Amino acid sequence: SLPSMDVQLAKYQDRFEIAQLRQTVATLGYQEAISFSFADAKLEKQLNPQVSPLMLANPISSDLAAMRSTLLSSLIPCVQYNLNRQQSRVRFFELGLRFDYQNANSIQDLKQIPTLALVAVGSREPESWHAKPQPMDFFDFKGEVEEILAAGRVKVEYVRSERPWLHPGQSAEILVDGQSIGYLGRLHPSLENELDLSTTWVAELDQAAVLQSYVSNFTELSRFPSVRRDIALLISDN
Amino acid sequence: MKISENWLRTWVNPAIDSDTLSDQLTMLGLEVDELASVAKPFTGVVVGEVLTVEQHPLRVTTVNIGSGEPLQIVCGAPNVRAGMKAPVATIGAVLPGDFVESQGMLCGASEIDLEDGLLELPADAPVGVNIREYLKLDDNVIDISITPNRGDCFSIRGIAREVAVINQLQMNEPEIKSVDATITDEKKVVINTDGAPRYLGRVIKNVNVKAATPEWMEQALARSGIRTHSILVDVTNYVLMELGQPMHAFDLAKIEGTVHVRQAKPQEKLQLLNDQEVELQEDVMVIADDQKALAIAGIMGGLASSVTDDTTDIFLESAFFAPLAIAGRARRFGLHTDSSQRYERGVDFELPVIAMNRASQLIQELAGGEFGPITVAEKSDLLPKREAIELKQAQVDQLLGYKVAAEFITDALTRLGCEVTVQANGEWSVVPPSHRYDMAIYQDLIEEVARIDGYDNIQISLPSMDVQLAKYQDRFEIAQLRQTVATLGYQEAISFSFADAKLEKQLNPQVSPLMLANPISSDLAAMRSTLLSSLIPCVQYNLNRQQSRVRFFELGLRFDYQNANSIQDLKQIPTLALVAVGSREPESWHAKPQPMDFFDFKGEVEEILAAGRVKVEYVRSERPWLHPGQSAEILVDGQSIGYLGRLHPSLENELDLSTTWVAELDQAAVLQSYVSNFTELSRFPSVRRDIALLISDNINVRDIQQLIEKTGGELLDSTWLFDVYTGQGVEEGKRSLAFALLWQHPSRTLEDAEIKSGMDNIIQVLENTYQATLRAS
Amino acid sequence: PVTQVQERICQFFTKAGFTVATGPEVEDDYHNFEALNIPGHHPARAMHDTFYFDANHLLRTHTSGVQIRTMETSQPPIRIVCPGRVYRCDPMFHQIEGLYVAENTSFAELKGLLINLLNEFFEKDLKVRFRPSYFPFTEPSAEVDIMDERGRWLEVLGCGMVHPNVLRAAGIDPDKYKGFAFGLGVERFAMLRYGINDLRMFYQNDVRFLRQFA
Amino acid sequence: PVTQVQERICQFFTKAGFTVATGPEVEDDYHNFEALNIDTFYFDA
Numbered sequence A: 001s002l003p004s005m006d007v008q009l010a011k012y013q014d015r016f017e018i019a020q021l022r023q024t025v026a027t028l029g030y031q032e033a034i035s036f037s038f039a040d041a042k043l044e045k046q047l048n049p050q051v052s053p054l055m056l057a058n059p060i061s062s063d064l065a066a067m068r069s070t071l072l073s074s075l076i077p078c079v080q081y082n083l084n085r086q087q088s089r090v091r092f093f094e095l096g097l098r099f100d101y102q103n104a105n106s107i108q109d110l111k112q113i114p115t116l117a118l119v120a121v122g123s124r125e126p127e128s129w130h131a132k133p134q135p136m137d138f139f140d141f142k143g144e145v146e147e148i149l150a151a152g153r154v155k156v157e158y159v160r161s162e163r164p165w166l167h168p169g170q171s172a173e174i175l176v177d178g179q180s181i182g183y184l185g186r187l188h189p190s191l192e193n194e195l196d197l198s199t200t201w202v203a204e205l206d207q208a209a210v211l212q213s214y215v216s217n218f219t220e221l222s223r224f225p226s227v228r229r230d231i232a233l234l235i236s237d238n
Numbered sequence B: 001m002k003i004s005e006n007w008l009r010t011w012v013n014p015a016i017d018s019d020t021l022s023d024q025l026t027m028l029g030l031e032v033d034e035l036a037s038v039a040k041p042f043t044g045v046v047v048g049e050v051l052t053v054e055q056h057p058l059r060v061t062t063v064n065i066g067s068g069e070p071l072q073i074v075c076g077a078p079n080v081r082a083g084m085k086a087p088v089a090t091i092g093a094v095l096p097g098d099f100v101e102s103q104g105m106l107c108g109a110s111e112i113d114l115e116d117g118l119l120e121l122p123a124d125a126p127v128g129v130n131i132r133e134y135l136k137l138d139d140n141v142i143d144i145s146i147t148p149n150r151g152d153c154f155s156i157r158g159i160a161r162e163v164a165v166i167n168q169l170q171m172n173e174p175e176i177k178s179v180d181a182t183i184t185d186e187k188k189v190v191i192n193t194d195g196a197p198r199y200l201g202r203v204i205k206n207v208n209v210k211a212a213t214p215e216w217m218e219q220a221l222a223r224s225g226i227r228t229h230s231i232l233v234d235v236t237n238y239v240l241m242e243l244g245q246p247m248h249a250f251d252l253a254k255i256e257g258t259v260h261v262r263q264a265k266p267q268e269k270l271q272l273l274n275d276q277e278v279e280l281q282e283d284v285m286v287i288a289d290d291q292k293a294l295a296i297a298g299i300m301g302g303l304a305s306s307v308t309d310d311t312t313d314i315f316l317e318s319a320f321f322a323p324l325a326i327a328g329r330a331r332r333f334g335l336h337t338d339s340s341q342r343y344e345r346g347v348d349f350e351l352p353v354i355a356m357n358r359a360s361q362l363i364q365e366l367a368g369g370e371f372g373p374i375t376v377a378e379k380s381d382l383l384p385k386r387e388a389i390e391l392k393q394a395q396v397d398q399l400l401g402y403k404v405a406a407e408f409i410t411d412a413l414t415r416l417g418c419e420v421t422v423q424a425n426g427e428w429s430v431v432p433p434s435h436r437y438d439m440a441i442y443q444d445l446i447e448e449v450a451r452i453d454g455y456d457n458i459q460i461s462l463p464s465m466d467v468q469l470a471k472y473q474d475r476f477e478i479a480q481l482r483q484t485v486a487t488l489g490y491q492e493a494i495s496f497s498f499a500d501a502k503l504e505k506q507l508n509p510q511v512s513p514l515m516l517a518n519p520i521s522s523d524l525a526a527m528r529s530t531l532l533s534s535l536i537p538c539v540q541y542n543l544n545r546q547q548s549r550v551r552f553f554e555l556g557l558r559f560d561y562q563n564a565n566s567i568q569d570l571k572q573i574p575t576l577a578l579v580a581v582g583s584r585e586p587e588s589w590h591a592k593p594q595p596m597d598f599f600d601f602k603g604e605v606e607e608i609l610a611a612g613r614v615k616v617e618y619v620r621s622e623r624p625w626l627h628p629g630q631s632a633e634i635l636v637d638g639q640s641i642g643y644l645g646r647l648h649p650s651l652e653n654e655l656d657l658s659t660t661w662v663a664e665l666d667q668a669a670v671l672q673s674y675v676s677n678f679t680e681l682s683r684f685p686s687v688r689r690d691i692a693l694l695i696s697d698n699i700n701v702r703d704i705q706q707l708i709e710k711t712g713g714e715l716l717d718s719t720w721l722f723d724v725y726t727g728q729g730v731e732e733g734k735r736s737l738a739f740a741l742l743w744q745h746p747s748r749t750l751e752d753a754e755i756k757s758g759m760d761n762i763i764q765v766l767e768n769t770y771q772a773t774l775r776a777s
Numbered sequence C: 001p002v003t004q005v006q007e008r009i010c011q012f013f014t015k016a017g018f019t020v021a022t023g024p025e026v027e028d029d030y031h032n033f034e035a036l037n038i039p040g041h042h043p044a045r046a047m048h049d050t051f052y053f054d055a056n057h058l059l060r061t062h063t064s065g066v067q068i069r070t071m072e073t074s075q076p077p078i079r080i081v082c083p084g085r086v087y088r089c090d091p092m093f094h095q096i097e098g099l100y101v102a103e104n105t106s107f108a109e110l111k112g113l114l115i116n117l118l119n120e121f122f123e124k125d126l127k128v129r130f131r132p133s134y135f136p137f138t139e140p141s142a143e144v145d146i147m148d149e150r151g152r153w154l155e156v157l158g159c160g161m162v163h164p165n166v167l168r169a170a171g172i173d174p175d176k177y178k179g180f181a182f183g184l185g186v187e188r189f190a191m192l193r194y195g196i197n198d199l200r201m202f203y204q205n206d207v208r209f210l211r212q213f214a
Numbered sequence D: 001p002v003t004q005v006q007e008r009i010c011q012f013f014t015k016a017g018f019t020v021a022t023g024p025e026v027e028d029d030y031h032n033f034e035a036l037n038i039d040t041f042y043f044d045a
């Protein structure tokens, strides 16, 4: 037999769906990875030396004993898996639950945040006859993160991040309305050598901030031509 | 339809405000589009009687408004004055577009929102009474919108029946008095067709066709949209609006012999009352005699048999014409008359005798004459059948979803004019009235119950269904295609499916465009053979508004009408188009803005095809609207699914465009279903090898790649070109290509003997096949 | 924005049992008129405001052909929504027309499904009005309004219960199966949803206008 | 691959009235065992 039910149209607001997020990140050239929710506590300490990770009571191994405070503690072994097998260019993205456990006095204070991770090593685009393969710089990676954010109608201000595992001069904190929703930037070059990773580009974003609802409002368009003007400032670099 | 509300309330007065009256009609299926007064509001002004004038050509005069002393008003109205009864504003400023010391202006015929300047009233000049009350200017004109199923509601009698049913009143139907026959000079009527099962004709002699037009009949017609002409046409127009039966009067001195209602002879000529000469067909009914033709039956009369100012004898027609025998004939000659539209929707077939008595009594009151007997030409059993309709209480319950009281069902149908007899128990046999042409099945009766009981009394419920997991195969969805193209930097456009034929011929001069028979304009006449014919105007639209960069994509239909011998050979295929003008990326500090090349655009199209697991091969395209050297045809299994390339520079310049990049692809090939099979991965490392070529310039890189992959064998995993050199050291006509060769073995480590054996085999083939010089890095 | 509103209206039915259906835009006369309980020279033709090529080939005035072909080939239950662009001489606009045919349905279920469709689309607690109207393919037929702007009643969609002759002409017994249908103009919903007043911008395709919905 | 399989199994139900429901992966004993009439990775008791 078959069950029966009433045809009721459920409430739905226009939003950036998770499926449309995958299609954008895949269009930008990233492969969806799915790594373990628990990782090694030593690699978790390498990224953030001031981390207090949630430890399993009976882990099957030492490298799967700490609930990942960041998706890098589980994605980096997957990158190293490919890098050790004659793979110059591996680009991953995962969705994506991390476990915030710092400054917590009990396990009920644990925060399980669904996030969007980005890990990219090697050249931006695959090797072709157009140019010699060279790794991305900060603005190649920011141009990809800015489009993922723009694909969800997210207005964002950037500020310098102070996360330990990041290059302090080339790492941004992604703020909306003053509060942070993630980061973007390259790994700290010291961590790149300890992990044998060449130059990596990492980023993490809260899904609740990317997969947000939106509403469009129409504004009138002027019917007369605009005017273009140029200004050339000579200002300090700071 | 327009009707004066005061005329309607003489038939039924529901004792409610005029706003609720229209909302009743609107909620009964007869939507009121507008309810406004006959004239716009203004201050209390009175039509006054002029006493004396003072010459001085303007003209100073004295008007008596019936209060105190006669006012002194100076005006230049050239109409009859000095003793006339004309409107005049006492004091104020209330005109819709206006405002012995000169105090006011002798009010004109116009500028009162209802209209020789300064028209004096006929007679019965009121002394001080507001002109709005004398002419009934505060009456309302209800603009009803009747659907074609309510053919009975095209009159006061039809509307009054609706207002009476919703308010549970009984119509004040004016008792009509018949006119007895004084003379006996009747005519003979013969019905040669079946579209006129009831024809009534009466002869009236010695009528005053040049004098009457009462004020009450002029206003009742004017507020319904009908102007006055002669007196008989006004009488037939009034009885048309009052009861719903159209009528027409002929010149009896111009009807020679028996009156025939027949089908028109093939291409029979006739000059209508609007001086228009039409040639009829054997499909349109006609009113003819024994020689000529007099009138198109039920649509418009002829200029010959028209009642002119030299007419003395008159033959009055009052017939019922079948709707299926009139529909479409009026529009065929570019005609939309009050008689034609009412006959098409359905006129009450029991009205000819009633309308004959009404017009006759009206004629005898307003004109003189000897009334002959009414000639009844009636073919019964051909009249509209009103057979009884079975209707159960279980039917209205299941079709409405809720339960209406059986008391209401029988009462609502009865008030609408139905003879409902309660057969047995709980079941009914409903006989529809003669004026309703929309009652035939039991669904029509249940709609009447919901109409009268109220659509706001329909209870809320939800449909139930069996949840069954429908068939679905994995594919590139349309919503996922929009996301991929939007990430590539394209905005979705929706252009018209029809474009200009000039641009359609500019793109492809050998095109066979599907052109419209009634295009809305010259630039929207031909259905687009390509989406470019409709997207290029939108691209030019932005460019004409300071927009350097515009990147469009549309997912619509193109109409392939080439090499088609008939219209059913048309192929309407859904396509995805891409149009790009300007730089690839918006202006930033990273690089100066520069337009795309073929490889910037190919990289985007390749990713769209890659997003749908589409394997393609590129060959040179031959589209006339493309650059021959930088155009590509996209082939899947040898057959083309689309193209991409640069617009032809001559065509690119004729349209005043920069470097434009166009592409089109069949949606059926892009949004394809797919299935992926897992193949084993090797545990053993690969071996990278390079090959440098010096080959002729006219050897495609793809042809070289598939020859390397073929002669390489199974051990060769992947190949990809990683460098092209065309600088110093390369003879003009050749080029240096550098291929990367990835070697893999499924179950072991590759030995250096196998690879060198494969490389030497590949270089030997490439040396002999293309006469090239090679190396092995 | 027209495709966004079109996807928003369809997703209510898509994830609730209905399947999106599409068809050709150049139709003939039977699937557009004769199969919809229109005898032929009926007043419901209006050959002026309908683009045509021959005498039996025209542009769609509504997406009725897909619903006709679905009934003639498939058998109830039928649960489809039919979006797509249609044409009339005034000129190109989109409208969504749903069709539901099962063993039994009623006017009560049509009103409820339409009410929460209007409520969940506009995301408001609307005041809806059901007026009686006429369509040759429905009986009883209705037209729904919403109290938009300043207390005004604006038509948003027409509906009705599928006429028995429309089911019988497609091979469906009108005694063993019931059905309703509706039809709403997409440009009407898009303007009321986004606050647009000149629908000519929908097809001028000004990149500044399109960017406002991004 | 499991994401594509997951979205295929779910779309059969989402298109048929069902809705997707997710939740945290660190659970308590009541919502994972006690409420269901009842070698597990645990943290505390």
Ligand SMILES: C1=C(CCNCc2ccccc2)CCCC1
Residues within 6 Å of the ligand: C036, C062, C063, C064, C067, C068, C097, C098, C099, C135, C137, C138, C158, C159, C160, C162, C163, C166, C180, C181, C182, C183
């Ligand atoms: C309905 C149709 C006609 C297509 N238009 C839909 C519509 C319905 C009711 C009101 C307005 C519009 C196709 C066959 C089955 C019944």
Ligand SMILES: [Mg+2]
Residues within 6 Å of the ligand: B149, B438, B444, B447, C139
């Ligand atoms: Mg009806």
